[PDB]
C-alpha cells in the first residue's frame, strides 16, 4: 500500500511537471510561426544488424532470467547438482556468445 | 547451411519429439513441442526464397496458436486436478482444448488450412519431415489422453479430415499439395480408430509414414515437384515410373498392397463397436481419394507422356542422389499385407 | 455430510503469555532449554494427531510452563532481562549480535541465581525423543478402506491357441 | 443467523471425511469487518 | 603450448583472463578442502521445526534434551 | 488395450516370460517371406541405381536378405509373445469371472425349432 | 506411444514436479497435501476406469479442497442471510465481529 | 479444373524462387560543410 | 421411411439439382427414420 | 473497494486486452500490451509472488516487449497526427484518458455486482497468508529448486536457448 | 468456477480472437499471441501461488523463457518477410494460393 501510494505520488509529480512544462510557455502569445533532417523524405531503411543485436539481447536476457535464482540456489542441500547446473547455464550462455562470435554475427556492431 | 548445424538442428527436432514421447509431466510435453517447432523452422528456410519464408511464417503461427491452446488446456487441468501427470484430463474444457490443439498440430480439418500451403512452400526433405516426423508427438499425446477425449468431437474432426483431404486432391497438380491432402485424409483415418483401438492408430501411422517416405524419397530422386514434371520420368529413369505409382496405389489403400492393411483394420475394429455407417462412409471418401490418385497414375504411366530433347543429355548421367532406404521402403510399402498379424508388436 | 465438532469457548480459555515478540526472543534459548519437555510433548502430539482439537491440554501445559518460566525470570532476574529485551526491541530485524553485553549480563544473572546454561550453537535444533502415555493415532488421516487391487497374472505362458486368429492367418 | 432457512445444519462440514481440514481465510475472518480482512489477507503482502 | 599461450596473451588478454578464470571456477571446487563444509553448513541450518520422535524404548542415539551429549554436533562450526 | 499389462515392465522388447514360448523355426514361412522381401529389396536396390539386377552386389543382396531375416525373427518372436499374452489374459479373465461367462446349454436339434422357409 | 524411458533407466526426469504431495524443498506441504495423498493412495494401481467410480469420494474432497466451491457457496449463503437480517433488523453483530474485544493471544 | 476465380492463377516457378536501395543523407550546414552521403547501413 | 423419402425429395425441389437431390436428400432422410427404427449409431460408443 | 483490488486489476487487465486486441496499429497495440502486462503483474504481486512479478517487469516488459517495440519501429512507417495548440495536443489527451478511467469505473455497475455480490470473492480470496511459512518465501525456494531438483528442466531449457541462438542466426542470414 | 480466473481466461480468449481475426499486420498477430502468453503466465502463477505448491514455482519462468524464445523466432520471421516485401502485411503473404 505504501508502495502504491509512493508510485501514485511519483506519477502525479511527473504528470504535474509535464503539464506545467507544456502549459506554462503556451500562455505566451509569441507568434504564429510559418513553416515549422539529413534524409529528404525517403523511407526508413531497415538495418538487419540492429535487429540482430535486439534478438541477441532477448536471448541472453532469457538466459539471465534462468540465472537469477542463484543467490537462493546456493542455500541448497544438493550442492554438487546446483553447482553443476549453474556452471552449465553460464557455460551455455558462453557457448551462445562463442557461436554468435564465430558466425560473424557480432560485426559492424561488434 | 553448415552440416554440423544441420545435424545439431535435426537432433534437436528429434529430441523435442522424444521429449514429448517419454515425459510424464505436461510442462515437458509443452517444452518438447516448443523445441520441436523452434528447431524445425530453419529446415523449412533452408533455401531462402519468399515461399519458404511465407510457409515458415504460416507454420509458426498455426503451431504457436496450438502451443498456447495446449498450455491453456494444461492450466485448466491444473485447476481441476492440482497435478501434472500426463494421463487423462479432469475437465471436458481441458479435453476439448487439448484435442483442438493437437488437431491444429496435426493439421486435421478444419484446422487443415496450413498443410498444403506450408508443404508447398518448403523443399521436399523438409516436407517429408513435416508430414512424417511431426505427426509423431501429437499422436503420442492423443494416445495418452484417450480416456478424456470426447467421442463426438474426435469423430467429427476425423470425418471432416477425411472429407476435406479427399476433396482437396481434385484440382491439384503440385505433388507436395497432393501429399498434404493425403496427410489430412490419413490423419482422419488414424484418429477415427483412436478411441476404439489405438494399436490400429499406430499401425496406420507406421504404414502411412513408410508410404509417405517412399513417395517423398522418389520425388527427391527424380527432382519432380509437379505432376507435369513427374510425367517425364519414363524417358529418364524407367524403374522410377512403376515404383512411384504402385506406391501411390498403396497410399490410397488398395489390396493386395500394404496400404489397404490400415484402413481394413480400422474398419474391422470399428465394426466390433457396432459402428457400421461410419467406416462405410469414411472408406467411400477414401475411394474418392482413389479416384483422384488413380487419375494421377493414369497421367504418369499412361496418357500424357511427351518428352523434351534434353533428356538425350540426361541419359548420359546416372543418379548420384543417396536414395536412402528407397528399396527397403518400397518393399515395405507394397508387400507387407501377408505379414498383417505383425501388428501385435504395437500393442 | 456431518457436523464438524468444535470445542467450547471454555475449552479454549487459558492464561495467555501477554508479552511481545522481542520479549519472547530475548528469553528464547533459555525457554527452549528449560521448557523443553511439555513443548516437545505438544509438538509430538501436534504432528501425530494432525488436529488442533486433540492437542488442547498439551497446549495448555505449554502455556502453563511458559508462564512459570517468565514468573521465574520475574522473581530473580527482572532488570537484566528488561535491559536485554529493550535492546533487542530497538532493532528492526531484532538482531542478537547488536546486544552482546546485555546478553552477557542476562546470562550471568541467570546462571548465578538459577543455574540455567544457555544452549550451545546446534543444540536447540536437535531432533529429540519424547516419552508419551497417549496411544499412537492409528488412522490420523481417517482414510477409509482401500480399493482391492486388480488380480495379477500367474501361471506359465502357453502359446497362442491356433496363432493370431486374424481372419485366415493360421499363425 | 441461520434459523429461518429450512434444512440447514450449523457446522456442516463440506467434506466427506472427519479429518481436520485447515480453515480458509473466510472461515475465520469471514463474518468480521473489512479492516480485519485487509490486515489478514493483504497485510504482509503490502507491508512496505 | 607456451608459444601459443604467450601469443594469445599478447593478442587477446581479455579472453585469456576469461578462459583462465572460468577454468579455475570449474576445476577448483573439486580440489578444495572446504567444499564439504558448504554442504555441512547448508544441512545444519534449521529452517524447519525438529519434530521429535516417540520414544519406543530403544533409541540410544536420539537425545531427550538438546543439552544431552548424544545428537549431531556443531562444535566444528564454532571452531573451524 | 494391453497397455496396462506392459507398464510394470516398460520398454522390454521380449520379456523373460517370452522365453517360455517356443521360438519360430528358421524354416518359418513368415520368416521365409521376410527373406523374400530382403531379396526384393536387393533387386530393387540394383534396379534403381542401374546395375545388373541378378549379378551386381551379391554381398549387398545377401546383407539385405540377412538383415530382413535378422529383424523379422525378433519381430515374429514379439508377435508370438503378444498373442500368447492376449490368450493368457483372456483365459485368466474367463476363469476369474464365471458369472459373466456361463456355459450355455447346447440343445440338440430334436428340441431346437427352426422356421422352415421353402424355396418355391 | 509412451516410451517409458524414465522407468526403464531408473532415472527421474520429471516425476518430482508432477504432484503436490511429492518431496518439496524444506518440507513445505501444499494446501491440499492430505487430500491429494488420500486420492492417490485410493486410486493407485487399480486403473482409471475403476478409479473414477471407486475413488469418487476422495476425489470430490480433493477437488473441493482445491477450488472451495461448496465452502464459498456456504459462506455466501451465510453472509447474504446476514445482510438480509441486518437490513430487516432482526440481527446485530457481536463485539468480536466489529473489532472491539482485543484478540486471544 | 479451372473455374472462374482460379483461372487467373499463373503457375509457380520451377526452382520455387520468385522475382523480387541504400540510404542517402544530406548533412547540411545546420567551418561550414555540406555532405551528401550514401550510406549502406 | 417412405414419409421422409417424400419430404427429402420435396426439399430438393426447394433446394434451388431438382430431381438429383430428390434421390439424394430423400435417400439421406430415409436413413434417418430407419436409424430411429433399428437403433443405428454413427457416433458409436466404444464397447470392446 | 480496497479489498477487491485483485478483481479490479483483473478488470483492467481484460479491458487492456480488449484495447490492443482490436488492433488500431501495432504500436498502440504494443502500448496497450505494456499497460496490460503492468496491471497483470500487479495481479501477481497482490498474491505475494514477488519474484514472478519482477520477472514480468524484468523479462516480459523489460526484454521482450522492448524487442517487439524495437522491431515495430523498424517497420510500419510513421506519419504525423493532429498537433494544434495545447488544448488540442494535450487537453484532448487528458479528456480521452478521463473517458477511459470513467469507463473503468462505468463497467463496475449494478449488472456487475450481481456477479460480484452473489459470488463474493473477497472475504476469502487471497489465502496465501494463511498461517506461517517461516524464514523464507515458498515461492522463492520453489524457484530456487530449479538447480537442485530441476536438472532436466535446466538441460532442456538451456539447450533450447542455445538452439534458439543458432536458429535465429540461420534464418536471419538469408543465405 | 473461481472468480479472477474467469477474467484471466476471458483475457486469453479476447487475445485469441484478436489473433483469430487478422486486420492488417503480422506484428499485431504476434502481439495477440504474446498477450495469450501473458495471460497464461498470470493464470499459471495465480494457481501455483494459491495452491502453495512449491516446485511448480519454476514453471511460469520456464513458460516465459520458452515462449519468449518463440517470440524471438516470430520477430525474425516477420523481419525476413518485411525484407522480402517492404511491409509486414498479411496480404503480401499469399503466394501459396497456387
Ligand atoms: C533394428 C532396426 C534397424 C533399421 C535399419 C537400420 C539401417 C538403415 C537405416 C540407416 C541407414 O540408412 O543406414 C545405411 C544403410 C544403407 O542404406 P541404403 O542407401 O538403402 O543402401 C544402399 C546400398 O545398399 C548401399 O550399398 P554400398 O555399395 O554402399 O555398400 C553395401 C552396404 C554396406 O554395408 C555396410 O556398411 C554394413 C557394414 C557396417 C555396419 C555397421 C558397423 C558399425 O550394404 C548394404 O547396404 C546392404 C543392405 C543393408 C540392409 C538394408 C536394410 C536393413 C534392414 C531394414 C529393416 C527391415 C525390416 C523389415 C520388416 C518386415 C516385417 C515387418 O544400411 C547400411 O549401410 C547397413 C545396414 C545394416 C542393417 C542391420 C540390420 C539389423 C539391425 C539390428
Ligand atoms: C521378383 C519380384 C520383384 C522384382 C524387383 C526387381 C525387378 C527388376 O529389377 O527386374 C529386372 C530384371 C530383368 O531386367 P534386366 O534385363 O536385368 O535389366 C533391366 C532392364 O534394363 C529394364 O530396362 P528399364 O528399366 O531401363 O526400362 C524398361 C522399363 C519398361 O517399363 C515401362 O515402360 C513401364 C512399365 C509398364 C507399366 C507397369 C507394369 C507393371 C509394373 C508394376 C508391377 C505391378 C504388379 C504388382 C502387384 C500390384 C501392385 C500395384 O522398366 C522396366 O521394365 C522395369 C524393370 C523391372 C521390371 C519389374 C519391376 C518390379 C518392381 C515392382 C514390383 C515388385 C514390388 C511391388 C510388389 C507389389 C505387390 C505384389 O528382372 C529380374 O531380375 C526379375 C527376377 C528374375 C529372377 C528371380 C530369381 C528368384 C530367386 C529366388 C531365390 C533366392 C531368394 C530367396 C529369398 C528367401 C530366403 C529365405
Ligand atoms: C526338418 C527341418 C526343416 C523343415 C523344412 C520344411 C520346409 C522345406 C523348404 C524350406 C522353405 C519353406 C518355405 C515356406 C513353407 C511353405 C509356405 C507355404 O506355402 O504356405 C502356404 C500358404 C497357406 O497354405 P496352407 O495350405 O494353408 O498351408 C500349408 C503349410 O501348412 C504352410 O504352413 P503354415 O500354415 O504354418 O503357414 C503359416 C502362414 C500360412 O498362411 C496363411 O495363414 C494364409 C495367409 C498368407 C498370406 C496371404 C496374403 C494375401 C494378400 C497378399 C498377396 C500378395 C501377392 C501374392 C504374391 C505376388 C508375387 C510376389 O504363413 C503366412 O501367413 C506367411 C505369409 C505368406 C508367405 C508364405 C511363405 C513364402 C515363402 C517364400 C516366398 C517367395 C515368394 C512367393 C510370393 C510371396 C507371397 C506368398 O499359401 C498361401 O498363403 C498362398 C501363397 C503361396 C505360399 C508361398 C509358397 C512358398 C514357395 C514359393 C515358391 C515359388 C517362388 C517363385 C519366385 C518368387 C515369386 C514370384
Ligand atoms: C520550476 C522553475 C520555476 C517556475 C517557473 C517560472 C516562474 C515564474 C512564472 C511566471 C513568469 C511570468 C509569466 C510567463 C512569462 C511571460 C513572458 C512573456 O512573453 O510575456 C508577454 C506575454 C504576451 O504579452 P503581449 O500581449 O505583449 O504579447 C507579445 C507578443 N505579440 C505582441 C506578438 C502578440 O504575456 C502574457 O502572455 C501574459 C501571461 C500572464 C502573465 C503572468 C501572470 C502571473 C503568473 C504567475
Ligand atoms: C549434459 C548434461 C550434463 C549434466 C547432467 C546432470 C548432472 C547431475 O548432477 O545430475 C544429477 C541430477 C539429480 O541427481 P541427484 O543426485 O541430485 O539426485 C538426488 C535427488 N534429489 C534431486 C531429490 C535431491 O539429475 C539426474 O540425475 C537426472 C536428470 C539428468 C539426467 C541426464 C540428462 C542428460 C542429457 C544429455 C543430453
Ligand atoms: C447398400 C450399401 C451400403 C450399406 C452397407 C451396410 C453394411 C452392413 O453391414 O449393414 C448392416 C447394418 C446393421 O447394423 P447393426 O447390425 O449394427 O444394427 C444395429 C444393431 N441391431 C442389429 C441390434 C439392430 O446396417 C446399417 O448399419 C444400416 C446403415 C448402413 C450404412 C449407411 C449407408 C449409406 C449409403 C452408402
Ligand atoms: C511408433 C513409431 C515411433 C517412431 C519410430 C520411427 C519413426 C521414423 C519416422 C521417419 C521420418 C523421416 C523424416 C525424414 C528423414 C530425416 C532425415 C533427413 O533430413 O533426411 C533428408 C535429408 C536432407 O538432406 P539435404 O541436404 O536437405 O538434401 C536435399 C538436396 N540437397 O536427406 C535427403 O534428402 C536424402 C534423400 C533420401 C532421404 C530418405 C529419408 C528416409 C527416412 C524414412 C525411412 C523410413 C521410416 C523408418 C521405418 C518405419 C518407422 C515407422
Ligand atoms: C573450461 C572453462 C570454461 C571455458 C568456457 C567459458 C569461458 C568464459 C568466457 C566465455 C567467452 C565466450 C567467447 C569465446 C570465443 C572464443 C573464440 C574467439 O574469440 O576467437 C577469436 C579470437 C581472435 O580475436 P579476433 O577474432 O581478432 O577479434 C577481433 C579483436 N582482435 O581468438 C581468441 O581470442 C582465441 C580464444 C581461444 C583461446 C584462449 C586460450 C586461453 C587459455 C587460458 C589458460 C587455460 C584456461 C583453462 C580453460 C581451457 C582453455 C582452452
Ligand atoms: C524394426 C524393429 C526395431 C525395434 C527396436 C526395439 C524397440 C523397443 O524395445 O521398443 C519397446 C516397445 C515395447 O514397449 P512398451 O512400453 O510396451 O510399448 C509402448 C506402447 N505404447 O516395443 C515396440 O514398440 C515394438 C514395436 C516396434 C516396431 C518398429 C517397426 C514398425
Curated annotation (Swiss-Prot), chain A:
Origin organism lineage: Eukaryota, Metazoa, Chordata, Craniata, Vertebrata
EC identifiers of the protein: 7.1.1.2
Protein name: NADH-ubiquinone oxidoreductase chain 3
Main EC class the enzyme belongs to: translocase
Any one GO molecular function term: NADH dehydrogenase (ubiquinone) activity
Organism: Ovis aries
Compartment(s): Mitochondrion inner membrane
Family the entry assigns: Belongs to the complex I subunit 3 family.
UniProt xrefs under InterPro entries: NADH_UbQ/plastoQ_OxRdtase_su3, NDAH_ubi_oxred_su3_sf
Coiled-coil blocks: none
Record's function text: Core subunit of the mitochondrial membrane respiratory chain NADH dehydrogenase (Complex I) which catalyzes electron transfer from NADH through the respiratory chain, using ubiquinone as an electron acceptor. Essential for the catalytic activity of complex I.
Catalytic function, reaction form: a ubiquinone + NADH + 5 H(+)(in) = a ubiquinol + NAD(+) + 4 H(+)(out)
One GO BP: mitochondrial electron transport, NADH to ubiquinone
UniProtKB/Swiss-Prot annotation, chain B:
A molecular function (GO) term: NADH dehydrogenase (ubiquinone) activity
Catalytic activity entry: a ubiquinone + NADH + 5 H(+)(in) = a ubiquinol + NAD(+) + 4 H(+)(out)
Source species: Ovis aries
GO cellular component, one term: mitochondrial inner membrane
Keyword match Transport: yes
Top-level taxonomy: Eukaryota, Metazoa, Chordata, Craniata, Vertebrata
Entries under Pfam families matching the protein: NADH_dehy_S2_C, Proton_antipo_M
Superkingdom field: Eukaryota
Record keywords: Electron transport, Membrane, Mitochondrion, Mitochondrion inner membrane, NAD, Respiratory chain, Translocase, Transmembrane, Transmembrane helix, Transport, Ubiquinone
UniProt key word Zinc-finger: no
Membrane association type: Multi-pass membrane protein
GO biological process, one term: mitochondrial electron transport, NADH to ubiquinone
Enzyme class: translocase
Role according to the record: Core subunit of the mitochondrial membrane respiratory chain NADH dehydrogenase (Complex I) which catalyzes electron transfer from NADH through the respiratory chain, using ubiquinone as an electron acceptor. Essential for the catalytic activity and assembly of complex I.
Transmembrane segments: 3-23, 25-45, 67-87, 96-116, 122-142, 145-165, 178-198, 200-220, 237-257, 274-294, 325-345
Family: Belongs to the complex I subunit 2 family.
Signal sequence range: none
Quaternary state and interactors: Core subunit of respiratory chain NADH dehydrogenase (Complex I) which is composed of 45 different subunits. Interacts with TMEM242.
Subcellular location: Mitochondrion inner membrane
Primary localization class, coarse: mitochondrion
Enzyme Commission number: 7.1.1.2
Protein's recorded name: NADH-ubiquinone oxidoreductase chain 2
Swiss-Prot record, chain J:
Compartments, record wording: Mitochondrion inner membrane
GO biological processes: mitochondrial electron transport, NADH to ubiquinone; mitochondrial respiratory chain complex I assembly
GO terms assigned for molecular function: NADH dehydrogenase (ubiquinone) activity
Keyword terms of this UniProt record: Electron transport, Membrane, Mitochondrion, Mitochondrion inner membrane, NAD, Respiratory chain, Translocase, Transmembrane, Transmembrane helix, Transport, Ubiquinone
TM ranges: 1-21, 25-45, 47-67, 88-108, 149-169
Organism superkingdom: Eukaryota
Membrane topology: Multi-pass membrane protein
Catalytic activity, as annotated: a ubiquinone + NADH + 5 H(+)(in) = a ubiquinol + NAD(+) + 4 H(+)(out)
Entry GO terms, CC: mitochondrial inner membrane; respiratory chain complex I
E.C. numbers: 7.1.1.2
Statement: the UniProt record of this protein carries the keyword Transmembrane helix: yes
Its job: Core subunit of the mitochondrial membrane respiratory chain NADH dehydrogenase (Complex I) which catalyzes electron transfer from NADH through the respiratory chain, using ubiquinone as an electron acceptor. Essential for the catalytic activity and assembly of complex I.
Subunit structure, as described in the record: Core subunit of respiratory chain NADH dehydrogenase (Complex I) which is composed of 45 different subunits.
Stated family: Belongs to the complex I subunit 6 family.
Protein name per UniProt: NADH-ubiquinone oxidoreductase chain 6
Organism whose genome encodes this protein: Ovis aries (Sheep)
Curated annotation (Swiss-Prot), chain K:
EC id: 7.1.1.2
GO cellular component: mitochondrial inner membrane; respiratory chain complex I
Protein name, per record: NADH-ubiquinone oxidoreductase chain 4L
Gene Ontology biological process terms in this record: ATP synthesis coupled electron transport
PANTHER family found in the cross-reference section: NADH-UBIQUINONE OXIDOREDUCTASE CHAIN 4L, NADH-UBIQUINONE OXIDOREDUCTASE SUBUNIT ND4L
Family membership: Belongs to the complex I subunit 4L family.
Transmembrane segments: 1-21, 29-49, 61-81
GO MF annotations in UniProt: NADH dehydrogenase (ubiquinone) activity
Keywords: Electron transport, Membrane, Mitochondrion, Mitochondrion inner membrane, NAD, Respiratory chain, Translocase, Transmembrane, Transmembrane helix, Transport, Ubiquinone
Compartments (UniProt record): Mitochondrion inner membrane
Oligomer and partners: Core subunit of respiratory chain NADH dehydrogenase (Complex I) which is composed of 45 different subunits.
EC top class, as a word: translocase
Biological role: Core subunit of the mitochondrial membrane respiratory chain NADH dehydrogenase (Complex I) which catalyzes electron transfer from NADH through the respiratory chain, using ubiquinone as an electron acceptor. Part of the enzyme membrane arm which is embedded in the lipid bilayer and involved in proton translocation.
Membrane topology per record: Multi-pass membrane protein
Catalysed reactions, as listed in the record: a ubiquinone + NADH + 5 H(+)(in) = a ubiquinol + NAD(+) + 4 H(+)(out)
InterPro entries noted in UniProt: NADH_UbQ_OxRdtase_chain4L/K (IPR001133), NUOK/Mnh_C1-like (IPR039428)
